């Protein structure tokens, strides 16, 4: 029975959208999305600004990680661990030609395909992130700094894609049946809120339901759980080897302006982040081997 | 007291969008987009795409004239004329700030508004286009080619926007109760099909439905019909002024090489059209007056 | 014999560019954009934006006449002049076949053109508010205001293109001769600047050197000195007919933080650029018909 | 004292520019950007072009291997050992500071390092690419195949940056001090052409001429003779371990359509531009290490 505990959790989650951003926080989301080479403001750190002094520090300790070969290359890592846990333990069906089937063009997959793609690379980052807050926070602890292989510490793969935001149909954007299908998402993946890869997704709903619908069985399962055990495993190994040392104790949280009542709260909501990370990652997989 | 009666179509309707365009069609779009100066392709230049040697025939005769001052001014006058038509024959309440309650930021609300801007730019320009392309079939007389006004025959004011093309969300990307508020625009509009500026407008399905039915009880009353009537003829008007003589009769047809019973059908078509493109503009106009 | 005679100003000029504006400054620059519906921020406004508070509140007080119908008409009408008075004027040989020979391709030469359209389009706009902040300094009296046809307060034609900001060959970007045509630019036109159109069209330096050696001649010439009065003369009669009434005084300059002595050195400074943009309009004018 | 020894190159080399390559040419270069994921087409790849059938059919046989987890791998690794290289046997000053005085904005150098980014991450894919289609003449040789670690045949790390083409100041666009520049390039890295990242870096002439001159004395010293042949053995390594087996001999050059003489004249070509690729990484890793 490989594990992963779903947290002790439902402290308030208060996000703040990237259009809602007011300009000191879009500089830090700029900087967020320039480092990690990605379009979109993830949903953990949209929750983790809500604690906005500890949010500009903790991402200014973990900055100089994240812009490391070494850093590319774990996340990287963790994409490929996930495709190959996927294909492994199940047996994905294709869906284009139901798609083509459904009235869907060449060019509308490929569309799809693309969007897909920004996240099975952009959440391992995030899930790495999530990793270190939670960790940093629980332990107290000094990750991470050693010199090693001096080629871990050198400049990442270099070239983004940072614009556009990709289109996401925002909870209060949805309609009747997006609803329904949104709060599905929420009691089976038991979450609060909906993650901005089904939102992307939710661009074109018809594809949404269908895509969500072969996934959904697979989740919870005894493979599943398992998978995420691993990616979760390595997730925490990633942060024991970041090349630039990374501390965010409790402590720092006070110094860095939060009170003690509100680095409890954060603590748990990095909680429920941290361990949701690891199965969007299977998620996205399963939806990217689908649109094989 | 007038109105524009609805012709008689029982022809079948098939638009090539963009996304399904081989290289040569897409060429043509390609110069349509760049000469109107608008980011997407017209469903009725689509459905006449169908017929694709009179399409490209018609539209190398048209251009000259769509490239033109006098066809920019005759196209804003007709948005102006709307404008105008729907300010005083309509109450129209500001919604800007129901969709605050329903959840949408002022950047959201921003977003929208140069989405309605888009297409109460465009849409005057091809219902002159589809006027054109109406009654040159129907009557085989010349239009326009005076010199005139020197001036009129000058370059058109030159900034536009061509790419990217519109975020849509078409008939097969609809879920269920979007499949709902399509079906309720075609009935209560009395069309075979979703027009663009809806389905952009889809992209925020909760803003449709809200904005679609502060425009539904408009529809075709008294002064809605008299004001379809004047932006009718005003189309008429700016065909029978063409800098550049528009010559496509029922022969010209035959010799760009369609059949006489192709020409009879996408005369139908083409009716069809016409006589939506009229009351599209006051749809968008509605929406626009609105997002005030 | 019409002659605009060229004012005193031996003021210093210090034009805030686009790259090396703060948050603050950025943000009115992207409003001013926007209204114009331009994609580049003009030297004449980053002078003036270097006595901040009197450009942001001369900027505020302008933004609702910028935003109606009737300044689009007003620019667009400027644009249109322009285009006659020269044509009328100069036998303007295309220069597309030297261009071709030269070894530019018929996709670079549409990518010249449509460089040209941004400052075709935008410059009349730059050239009227220019003549509202010299006027309203020079004069103290309040411009506009009356009642006169409701359809001028209408909003204008609205689609833009605001991004991205022309690529621009800044004077330290340049090379050696480079420098030169841009020291003999700033020579024949009498001007310590580079404008904003020059340095666009210096991404192709050997197009530059062409089309300014062809227009050269034509400085100063009496048909364009009688031109680029009237071109001026319409920018006055705009200001006189702007639908928001507009102020901004010697005094009010004074209540917005400015010295006596940065007032008077703003009033040079605005006048020099006034008088510029007449005969910057006429250039980009030649350059366009060149380019035909 | 290893050095990479230059070919003899008596043949005409003949680029089609992308601004050039009518509708059929022009799909192969964007399946070839949509594969390496790099927004500009190799000027090896334009040479190779001119012999279309050829291009198009090394191309459709390399791109199975190119859309490898593998090439991803082994791309990022040549750019990592340029970076080791560099790093050990030069003292590169930083230059920041000295553009900063010249004028450079920290925007604008800023937009100086995501140019080099570009082709930092891009260059080493055509270096491999380049080498399998000399290899494939030269040998006749089948390469790769090999089954290995399945991981190898992953996709490749997803994202993209596809458009748009960066801004180069073509040949034919030059000052009279560019055309000089460039012919201090060609002589000295002893080509007839000039690369694509160096038309990138001469938007900003200045900067082109600052970073030109830096890196000039270090050309042809024992240290970069020796790096380069270390490149360029890593290459040839590359080529061995591609993923989907490649096979493009000269048997398979005439089937192609290609005649005798025309394969003589290729393998010529191919044979400077693989010789020249390994250089261009040293030297854009060098240009990117005086920005940091």
Same mark, same amino acid.
């Given at each position: 029975?490989?594990?992963?505990?779903?947290?002790?959790?439902?402290?308030?989650?208060?996000?703040?959208?990237?259009?809602?951003?007011?300009?000191?926080?879009?500089?830090?989301?700029?900087?967020?999305?320039?480092?990690?080479?990605?379009?979109?403001?993830?949903?953990?750190?949209?929750?983790?600004?809500?604690?906005?002094?500890?949010?500009?520090?903790?991402?200014?300790?973990?900055?100089?990680?994240?812009?490391?070969?070494?850093?590319?290359?774990?996340?990287?890592?963790?994409?490929?661990?996930?495709?190959?846990?996927?294909?492994?333990?199940?047996?994905?069906?294709?869906?284009?030609?139901?798609?083509?089937?459904?009235?869907?063009?060449?060019?509308?997959?490929?569309?799809?395909?693309?969007?897909?793609?920004?996240?099975?690379?952009?959440?391992?980052?995030?899930? !790495?992130?999530?990793? =270190?807050?939670?960790? *940093?926070?629980?332990?107290?602890?000094?990750?991470?700094? +050693? %010199?090693? /292989? $001096?080629?871990?510490?050198?400049?990442?793969?270099?070239?983004?894609?940072?614009?556009?935001?990709?289109?996401?149909?925002?909870?209060?954007?949805?309609?009747?049946?997006?609803?329904?299908?949104?709060?599905?998402?929420?009691?089976?993946?038991?979450?609060?809120?909906?993650?901005?890869?089904?939102?992307?997704?939710?661009?074109?709903?018809?594809?949404?339901?269908?895509?969500?619908?072969?996934?959904?069985?697979? !989740?919870?399962?005894? =493979?599943?759980?398992? *998978?995420?055990?691993?990616?979760?495993?390595?997730?925490? +190994? %990633?942060? /024991? $080897?970041?090349?630039?040392?990374?501390?965010?104790?409790?402590?720092?949280?006070?110094?860095?302006?939060?009170?003690?009542?509100?680095?409890?709260?954060?603590?748990?909501?990095?909680?429920?982040?941290?361990?949701?990370?690891?199965?969007?990652?299977?998620?996205?997989?399963?939806?990217?081997?689908?649109?094989?």
């Amino acid at each position: 029975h490989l594990q992963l505990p779903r947290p002790v959790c439902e402290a308030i989650i208060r996000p703040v959208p990237e259009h809602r951003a007011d300009q000191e926080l879009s500089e830090i989301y700029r900087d967020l999305k320039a480092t990690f080479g990605v379009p979109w403001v993830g949903v953990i750190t949209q929750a983790v600004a809500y604690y906005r002094p500890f949010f500009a520090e903790a991402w200014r300790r973990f900055a100089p990680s994240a812009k490391t070969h070494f850093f590319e290359r774990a996340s990287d890592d963790i994409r490929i661990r996930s495709w190959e846990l996927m294909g492994q333990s199940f047996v994905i069906e294709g869906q284009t030609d139901r798609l083509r089937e459904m009235g869907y063009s060449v060019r509308e997959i490929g569309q799809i395909r693309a969007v897909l793609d920004i996240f099975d690379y952009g959440n391992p980052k995030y899930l !790495i992130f999530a990793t =270190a807050i939670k960790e *940093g926070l629980l332990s107290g602890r000094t990750f991470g700094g +050693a %010199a090693g /292989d $001096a080629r871990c510490h050198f400049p990442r793969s270099p070239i983004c894609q940072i614009d556009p935001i990709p289109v996401m149909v925002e909870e209060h954007h949805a309609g009747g049946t997006l609803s329904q299908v949104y709060a599905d998402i929420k009691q089976t993946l038991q979450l609060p809120f909906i993650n901005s890869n089904y939102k992307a997704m939710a661009r074109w709903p018809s594809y949404l339901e269908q895509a969500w619908g072969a996934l959904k069985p697979c !989740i919870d399962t005894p =493979a599943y759980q398992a *998978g995420r055990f691993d990616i979760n495993a390595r997730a925490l +190994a %990633a942060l /024991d $080897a970041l090349p630039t040392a990374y501390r965010m104790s409790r402590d720092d949280a006070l110094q860095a302006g939060l009170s003690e009542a509100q680095t409890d709260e954060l603590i748990q909501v990095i909680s429920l982040f941290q361990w949701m990370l690891s199965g969007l990652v299977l998620n996205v997989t399963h939806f990217k081997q689908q649109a094989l």
